[PDB]
């Protein structure tokens, strides 16, 4: 049972670069970097998907 990808998503190609390590708040965290918008998100929460 292949669960089809939901209605509205941004398909990003995995790179060995888009994941960077930078300081957020009071500690060091692994951070995502959104390719089309160039953002931060230093915690595993809203990314967006």
């Amino acid at each position: 049972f292949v669960p089809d990808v939901p209605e509205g998503y941004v398909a990003v190609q995995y790179a060995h670069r888009l994941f960077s390590s930078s300081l957020a708040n009071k500690r060091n965290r692994v951070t995502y970097t959104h390719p089309p918008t160039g953002m931060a998100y230093p915690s595993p929460t809203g990314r967006p998907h």
Partner: protein
């Protein structure tokens, strides 16, 4: 010590249990160059007083 997220839903109405809150202003910050550690911190019961 810490209250359980089940004893705070099915306990007698009369009981008075105390919680424990954190300040965090004189917390020691991270270093300059360092490999980031994993895992995250959570909070479940906030006051509304203040």
């Amino acid at each position: 010590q810490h209250v359980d997220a089940e004893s705070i839903m099915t306990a007698p109405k009369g009981k008075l249990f105390h919680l424990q809150f954190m300040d965090g202003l004189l917390r020691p910050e991270p270093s300059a160059f360092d490999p980031p550690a994993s895992g995250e911190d959570m909070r479940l019961i906030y006051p509304l007083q203040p």
